[PDB]
Design an enzyme around this catalytic site. Structure first.
Site, PDB file in Angstrom:
ATOM      1  N   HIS A   1       0.817  -1.253   0.000  1.00  0.00           N
ATOM      2  CA  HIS A   1       0.000   0.000   0.000  1.00  0.00           C
ATOM      3  C   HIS A   1       0.828   1.270   0.000  1.00  0.00           C
ATOM      4  CE1 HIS A   1       0.145  -0.038   4.540  1.00  0.00           C
ATOM      5  NE2 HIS A   1      -0.069  -1.326   4.353  1.00  0.00           N
TER       6      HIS A   1
ATOM      7  N   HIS B   1       4.086  11.140   6.029  1.00  0.00           N
ATOM      8  CA  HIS B   1       3.651  10.844   7.381  1.00  0.00           C
ATOM      9  C   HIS B   1       4.812  10.245   8.149  1.00  0.00           C
ATOM     10  CE1 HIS B   1      -0.809  10.507   6.021  1.00  0.00           C
ATOM     11  NE2 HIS B   1      -0.387  11.749   6.127  1.00  0.00           N
TER      12      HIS B   1
ATOM     13  N   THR C   1      -5.079   6.429   8.734  1.00  0.00           N
ATOM     14  CA  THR C   1      -5.792   6.639   7.468  1.00  0.00           C
ATOM     15  C   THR C   1      -5.844   5.388   6.641  1.00  0.00           C
ATOM     16  OG1 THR C   1      -3.853   7.355   6.200  1.00  0.00           O
ATOM     17  CG2 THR C   1      -5.074   9.061   7.444  1.00  0.00           C
TER      18      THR C   1
HETATM   19  N1  LIG Z   1      -1.349   7.161   7.362  1.00  0.00           N
HETATM   20  S1  LIG Z   1      -1.020   6.620   8.802  1.00  0.00           S
HETATM   21  O1  LIG Z   1      -0.008   7.447   9.417  1.00  0.00           O
HETATM   22  O2  LIG Z   1      -2.238   6.542   9.513  1.00  0.00           O
HETATM   23  C1  LIG Z   1      -0.405   5.065   8.662  1.00  0.00           C
HETATM   24  C2  LIG Z   1      -0.404   4.298   7.461  1.00  0.00           C
HETATM   25  C3  LIG Z   1       0.147   3.003   7.405  1.00  0.00           C
HETATM   26  C4  LIG Z   1       0.695   2.405   8.528  1.00  0.00           C
HETATM   27  C5  LIG Z   1       1.294   1.059   8.406  1.00  0.00           C
HETATM   28  O3  LIG Z   1       0.794   0.046   8.871  1.00  0.00           O
HETATM   29  O4  LIG Z   1       2.460   1.008   7.840  1.00  0.00           O
HETATM   30  C6  LIG Z   1       0.755   3.184   9.783  1.00  0.00           C
HETATM   31  S2  LIG Z   1       1.364   2.524  11.150  1.00  0.00           S
HETATM   32  O5  LIG Z   1       2.740   2.074  11.148  1.00  0.00           O
HETATM   33  O6  LIG Z   1       0.921   3.252  12.284  1.00  0.00           O
HETATM   34  N2  LIG Z   1       0.670   1.095  11.303  1.00  0.00           N
HETATM   35  C7  LIG Z   1      -0.767   1.010  11.579  1.00  0.00           C
HETATM   36  C8  LIG Z   1      -1.322  -0.387  11.321  1.00  0.00           C
HETATM   37  C9  LIG Z   1      -0.942  -1.333  12.418  1.00  0.00           C
HETATM   38  C10 LIG Z   1      -1.769  -1.465  13.533  1.00  0.00           C
HETATM   39  C11 LIG Z   1      -1.412  -2.349  14.557  1.00  0.00           C
HETATM   40  C12 LIG Z   1      -0.242  -3.113  14.451  1.00  0.00           C
HETATM   41  C13 LIG Z   1       0.587  -2.973  13.327  1.00  0.00           C
HETATM   42  C14 LIG Z   1       0.229  -2.090  12.307  1.00  0.00           C
HETATM   43  C15 LIG Z   1       0.177   4.470   9.797  1.00  0.00           C
HETATM   44 ZN   LIG Z   2      -0.058   7.717   6.078  1.00  0.00          ZN
END
Ligand SMILES: NS(=O)(=O)c1ccc(C(=O)O)c(S(=O)(=O)NCCc2ccccc2)c1
Ligand SMILES: [Zn+2]
Length: 257
Positions: free
Chosen positions: A61, A116, A195
């Site tokens: 993604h 981000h 997001t």
């Molecule tokens: N646009 S954003 O800043 O909201 C964002 C987008 C993608 C991710 C990600 O998973 O890499 C992340 S992240 O590293 O915070 N991961 C969130 C998903 C996740 C939840 C729980 C455990 C592992 C990953 C944030």
């Molecule tokens: Zn992001």
């Protein structure tokens, strides 16, 4: 599974992740005339001198530049935040063309991309615990416009050919994220969410007012990445942004007047 297409894109996510229609979802449109200056907000403290980047990953993604977050080395403090937030990764969202790509918008203006920098609140001990808390994460959002090249971005751009497809990673040490910051740290802030799925409502958003400029050639290289895995039908990794969500019962605060 979820993605950014017609059949699995942002308008479908609520079926697996009902919080998609929640009360503090991100991104949002930032109405500059309605955001109120809050003189009680502090200057952001961005302390990245000891940042240790490790690896870059195409996760299907976006691409994530990952940091060593096993101790306080790169931290975000101050601004609207209480306590210390540790940098874990940065990534971008971008468009198929320069007129779209950002997740946040500014008076409905879409930028070409949005960076981000994701940080987690060290009072919760680990990232997986932090995402379960309303003040678990702090994400620093920075808009990209197309103009002059950003020299500090080119090391990222030049590794992308090596992680073209989903599940590919590459060593990415000694990258300095201070080279991605604009001059001003003036910002807007509001309570929101991840997001991407799982869309958890655990984020204090800090979106910088000043965009960084990157070159058309730089962003064109983002658009050569693939959502798909190696050997699968090629789907260019473009338009990996969620559109603006209802502001609902939230106020966007400005650090500046
Ligand atoms: N646009 S954003 O800043 O909201 C964002 C987008 C993608 C991710 C990600 O998973 O890499 C992340 S992240 O590293 O915070 N991961 C969130 C998903 C996740 C939840 C729980 C455990 C592992 C990953 C944030
Ligand atoms: Zn992001």
């Amino acid at each position: 599974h979820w993605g950014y297409g017609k059949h699995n894109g942002p308008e479908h996510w609520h079926k697996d992740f009902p919080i998609a229609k929640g009360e503090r979802q991100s991104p949002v449109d930032i109405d500059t005339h309605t955001a109120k200056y809050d003189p009680s907000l502090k200057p952001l403290s961005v302390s990245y001198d000891q940042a240790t980047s490790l690896r870059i990953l195409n996760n299907g993604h976006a691409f994530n530049v990952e940091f060593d977050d096993s101790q306080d080395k790169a931290v975000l403090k101050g601004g609207p935040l209480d306590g210390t937030y540790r940098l874990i990764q940065f990534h971008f969202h971008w468009g198929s063309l320069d007129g779209q790509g950002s997740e946040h918008t500014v008076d409905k203006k879409k930028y070409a991309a949005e960076l981000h920098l994701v940080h987690w609140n060290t009072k919760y001990g680990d990232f997986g615990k932090a995402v379960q808390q309303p003040d678990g994460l702090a994400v620093l959002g920075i808009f990209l416009k197309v103009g002059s090249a950003k020299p500090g971005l080119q090391k990222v751009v030049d590794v992308l050919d090596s992680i073209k497809t989903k599940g590919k990673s590459a060593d990415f040490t000694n990258f300095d994220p201070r080279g991605l910051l604009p001059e001003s740290l003036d910002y807007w802030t509001y309570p929101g969410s991840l997001t991407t799925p799982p869309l958890l409502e655990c984020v204090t958003w800090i979106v910088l007012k000043e965009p960084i400029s990157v070159s058309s050639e730089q962003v064109l290289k983002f658009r050569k990445l693939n959502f798909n895995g190696e050997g699968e039908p090629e789907e260019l990794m473009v338009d990996n942004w969620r559109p603006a969500q209802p502001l609902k019962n939230r106020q966007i605060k400005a650090s500046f007047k």
